[PDB]
Amino acid sequence: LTLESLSNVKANSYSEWITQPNVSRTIARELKSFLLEYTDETGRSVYGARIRTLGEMNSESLEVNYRHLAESKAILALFLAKCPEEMLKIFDLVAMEATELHYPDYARIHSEIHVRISDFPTIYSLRELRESNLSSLVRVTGVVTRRTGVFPQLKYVKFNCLKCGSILGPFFQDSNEEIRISFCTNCKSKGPFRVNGEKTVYRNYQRVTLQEAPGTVPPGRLPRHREVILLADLVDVSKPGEEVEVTGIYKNNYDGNLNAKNGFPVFATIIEANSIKRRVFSWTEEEEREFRKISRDRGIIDKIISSMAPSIYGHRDIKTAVACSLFGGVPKNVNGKHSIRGDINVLLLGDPGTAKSQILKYVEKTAHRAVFATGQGASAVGLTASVRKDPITKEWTLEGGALVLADKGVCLIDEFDKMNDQDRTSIHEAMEQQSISISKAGIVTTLQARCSIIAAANPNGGRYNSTLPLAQNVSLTEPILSRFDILCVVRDLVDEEADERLATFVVDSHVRSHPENSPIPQELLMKYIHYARTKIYPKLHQMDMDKVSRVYADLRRESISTGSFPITVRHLESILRIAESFAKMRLSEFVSSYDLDRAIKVVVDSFVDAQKVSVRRQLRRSFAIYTL
Amino acid sequence: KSPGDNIDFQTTILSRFDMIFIVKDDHNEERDISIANHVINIHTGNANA
Numbered sequence: 001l002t003l004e005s006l007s008n009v010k011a012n013s014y015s016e017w018i019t020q021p022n023v024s025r026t027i028a029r030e031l032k033s034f035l036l037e038y039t040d041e042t043g044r045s046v047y048g049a050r051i052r053t054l055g056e057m058n059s060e061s062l063e064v065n066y067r068h069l070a071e072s073k074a075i076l077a078l079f080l081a082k083c084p085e086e087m088l089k090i091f092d093l094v095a096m097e098a099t100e101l102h103y104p105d106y107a108r109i110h111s112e113i114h115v116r117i118s119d120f121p122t123i124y125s126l127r128e129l130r131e132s133n134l135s136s137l138v139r140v141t142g143v144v145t146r147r148t149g150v151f152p153q154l155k156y157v158k159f160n161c162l163k164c165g166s167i168l169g170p171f172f173q174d175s176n177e178e179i180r181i182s183f184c185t186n187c188k189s190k191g192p193f194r195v196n197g198e199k200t201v202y203r204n205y206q207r208v209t210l211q212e213a214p215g216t217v218p219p220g221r222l223p224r225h226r227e228v229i230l231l232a233d234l235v236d237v238s239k240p241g242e243e244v245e246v247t248g249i250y251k252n253n254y255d256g257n258l259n260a261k262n263g264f265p266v267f268a269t270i271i272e273a274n275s276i277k278r279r280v281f282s283w284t285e286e287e288e289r290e291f292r293k294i295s296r297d298r299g300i301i302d303k304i305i306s307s308m309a310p311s312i313y314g315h316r317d318i319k320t321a322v323a324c325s326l327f328g329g330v331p332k333n334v335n336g337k338h339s340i341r342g343d344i345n346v347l348l349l350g351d352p353g354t355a356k357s358q359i360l361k362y363v364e365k366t367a368h369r370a371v372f373a374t375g376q377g378a379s380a381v382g383l384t385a386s387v388r389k390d391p392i393t394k395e396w397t398l399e400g401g402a403l404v405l406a407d408k409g410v411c412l413i414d415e416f417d418k419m420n421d422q423d424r425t426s427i428h429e430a431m432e433q434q435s436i437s438i439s440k441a442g443i444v445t446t447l448q449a450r451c452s453i454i455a456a457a458n459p460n461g462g463r464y465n466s467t468l469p470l471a472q473n474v475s476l477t478e479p480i481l482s483r484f485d486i487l488c489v490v491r492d493l494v495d496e497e498a499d500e501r502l503a504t505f506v507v508d509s510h511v512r513s514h515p516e517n518s519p520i521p522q523e524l525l526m527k528y529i530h531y532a533r534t535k536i537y538p539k540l541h542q543m544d545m546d547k548v549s550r551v552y553a554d555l556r557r558e559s560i561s562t563g564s565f566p567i568t569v570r571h572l573e574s575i576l577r578i579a580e581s582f583a584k585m586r587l588s589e590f591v592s593s594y595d596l597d598r599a600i601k602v603v604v605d606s607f608v609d610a611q612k613v614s615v616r617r618q619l620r621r622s623f624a625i626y627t628l
Numbered sequence: 629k630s631p632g633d634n635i636d637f638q639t640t641i642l643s644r645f646d647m648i649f650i651v652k653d654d655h656n657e658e659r660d661i662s663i664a665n666h667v668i669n670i671h672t673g674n675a676n677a
C-alpha cells in the first residue's frame with residue numbers, strides 16, 4: 001500500500017483501520033522510511049544521530065518531533081493525533097528495528113524502546129478536556145501537586161501451574177487491563193495458575209496529580225485537576241511544585257460497578273504520559289575554568305556583594321551578611337573531642353518595609369538546600385521534629401522538620417519573634433548541638449541539623465528604639481540572641497536623598513513591570529556558590545595569630561570600659577568563621593590579612609550597631625581603626 | 629548581688645546540688661591573650677597535633 005492508499009479508510013473507525021495487518025505493515029514501512037531518511041536539508045540525519053546518542057547513552061527514550069513527521073507524512077501525523085496507542089506500539093517496533101540496525105546486541109539489554117513525541121501543536125488546558133479527546137493525544141500544561149512512589153507494574157507476566165509446577169511462557173501485560181491465562185499447555189488443565197514474581201518482569205509506575213496553573217485559571221473558577229500515569233522511564237522526573245507540560249493519551253479509568261453515589265454511568269479519566277517537558281548546580285570543565293578566571297579578579301567579593309538580591313537596594317551590610325551565610329565557613333572537630341561550628345547565622349532585625357522577606361526569598365531562590373519556614377504561618381514546613389500518622393494512609397512517618405531538612409544548607413525563618421515555645425526549643429537545640437533529638441512513638445534517635453540560619457524579626461512595638469539596647473527591643477532571650485554570628489539591625493530613618501533614591505528605584509521597578517510596556521549573572525553565581533561551598537575548604541596559618549589576639553583584647557577592654565554586654569570568645573570565633581567564608585568567595589585555599597580585616601569589620605559593625613546610642617558614640621570612636 | 633539573687637530559681641536547688649561552680653570573666657589582658665591564642669591554635673590545627 002501507499003501513502004495515498006493510507007489516506008483512504010475502509011473500516012468503520014480509525015482504530016479498526018490501523019488494526020488491519022496490511023495497514024499496520026504499511027505504516028511500519030513508512031515509519032521506517034521516515035526514521036531512516038529524514039533530513040533537514042542540511043546534510044545531517046537528526047534521527048540517526050538521536051538513535052546513536054540513545055544507544056551510546058544506554059537509554060530507552062527516543063524523542064521524535066511531531067512537526068518533522070507532519071512535514072514528512074501528514075497522514076501518519078493525523079493518525080498519531082487521532083489514535084495514538086496502537087500507532088505508538090507500531091512506532092515502538094519500528095524504532096526498535098532501527099536501533100537493531102546499528103547495534104545488534106541492544107535487544108538483550110533493553111528489549112523495549114519508548115518513543116516520546118515532542119512539540120505537539122494543539123495546546124489544551126485541564127479545564128477544557130471534553131468528550132472529543134478520549135483515546136487521543138493531548139498536550140496539557142499544569143503544576144504537579146503531589147506524586148506517588150515508584151511501583152512495579154507487571155510487564156512480561158509469567159505463571160506457574162499448581163497441578164504440575166510447570167512455568168509458563170512470558171506474556172505481555174497490556175496497561176489497559178489485567179491479563180489472565182486459562183490453559184497450561186503441559187498438563188492440559190484449566191487449573192489455578194499463580195504469578196511468580198521472581199520470573200516476572202516489571203516496569204516502573206508513578207501516579208502524579210496535575211492541576212491547572214493558578215495564573216491561567218478564569219476568575220470565579222477553581223483549578224481543574226487530572227491524574228497522570230508515568231511509565232518506566234518517566235518516573236521521578238517532575239517534582240511537585242513546578243510547572244510542567246505533559247503530552248499523553250487521554251483515556252478512561254475503568255472501575256467496578258461505576259459510581260453508586262452519582263447514580264449516572266460516569267467514568268473517571270486519566271492521562272497516560274507520552275512525554276514530560278519542564279517549562280542545576282552542575283559545573284562542566286569550562287565552568288570551573290570560568291570560576292577560576294572570575295576568582296582571580298581583585299574585587300570579586302564586592303561583585304558578589306553587588307550580586308546579592310538585585311531587586312533590593314541600599315542594604316549593603318545585609319547583603320554582605322547574606323554572602324557570608326551563603327558561602328559559609330568550615331566546620332571542624334579537633335581530635336574528635338571538641339567541635340567548632342562552621343556556618344554563619346544571621347539575624348535581620350528590622351522595621352516593617354525594610355524588605356527582609358524579599359531577602360529571604362532571594363536566598364531561597366539562590367541557595368542549594370534552602371528551607372523556608374515561619375513561626376506564625378500554617379501552610380509551611382514545621383521547625384519541630386515529629387512522628388505523624390496519616391489519617392487515610394494510616395502510615396507513621398518521621399518528619400525531621402525544617403532544621404533537619406536544611407542540613408548542609410540554610411534554613412530561613414521568617415517572623416522569628418512570634419514563634420511558639422516548641423519551635424524556640426527546636427531552634428535552641430539546632431544551634432547548640434547542631435542536631436535534634438526525638439523520643440516519640442517508640443522512635444528514640446538524633447537527626448543531624450548542621451544548618452545555617454538566616455532569620456528575620458520585627459522589634460518590639462513596631463520600631464527599633466536606639467535608646468534601649470538590643471535585648472530590650474526583641475522578645476528573643478539572651479542565649480538565642482548570642483548564637484547569631486552577624487546581627488544586622490536595619491532601621492528606616494528619614495533621609496531625604498535616601499528616600500528619593502529608594503522611591504525612584506521602586507517606581508522604576510513598577511514602570512518596568514507594566515504589561516503594556518558588574519553584578520555576576522544569577523545562573524553563574526548559583527553554581528559559583530555551590531562550587532566554593534563544595535570544594536574549597538579554606539585554612540588559616542600560624543603566623544597571623546599575633547593580630548587577632550591583639551584586636552580581641554582591644555575590643556574586650558573597651559567593652560569592659562564602656563559597660564555594654566560583653567565581648568566573649570564567640571566573637572573571636574565569629575571573626576575566624578566569617579574570615580573563612582570571605583576566603584571562599586576568592587576560591588582561596590588560605591586566609592589572608594585583608595580577609596581577616598574585612599571579617600573584623602563585619603563583626604565590629606555588627607556588635608556596635610546593636611547598642612545603646614551612648615554606647616554607640618564611644619564605641620564608634622574607639623573602634624575607628626578597625627572600621628576604617 | 630547575692631548568689632541566690634542572681635539565680636532565676638529558688639535557693640533550695642542550690643543546696644540540692646553537690647558542687648556549685650561560679651564561673652568568672654576575669655576581664656584582664658593577661659588571660660584573654662592566652663585564651664585568644666588557644667582558640668587560634670584550635671582553628672589552625674596546631675592543637676590537634
Ligand SMILES: Nc1ncnc2c1ncn2[C@@H]1O[C@H](COP(=O)(O)OP(=O)(O)OP(O)(O)=S)[C@@H](O)[C@H]1O
Pocket residue numbers: 311312313314315350351352353354355356357358359458502506
Ligand atoms: N530597600 C528596598 N529596596 C527595594 N524594595 C524595597 C525596599 N524596602 C522595601 N521594599 C519593598 O517594600 C515592600 C516590603 O515588603 P516586605 O519584604 O514584606 O517587607 P518586610 O521587610 O518583610 O517587613 P515585614 O513584612 O513587616 S516583616 C516590598 O514590596 C519590597 O519590594
Ligand SMILES: [Mg+2]
Pocket residue numbers: 356357
Ligand atoms: Mg515580611
Ligand SMILES: [Zn+2]
Pocket residue numbers: 161162163164165166184186187188189
Ligand atoms: Zn499444569
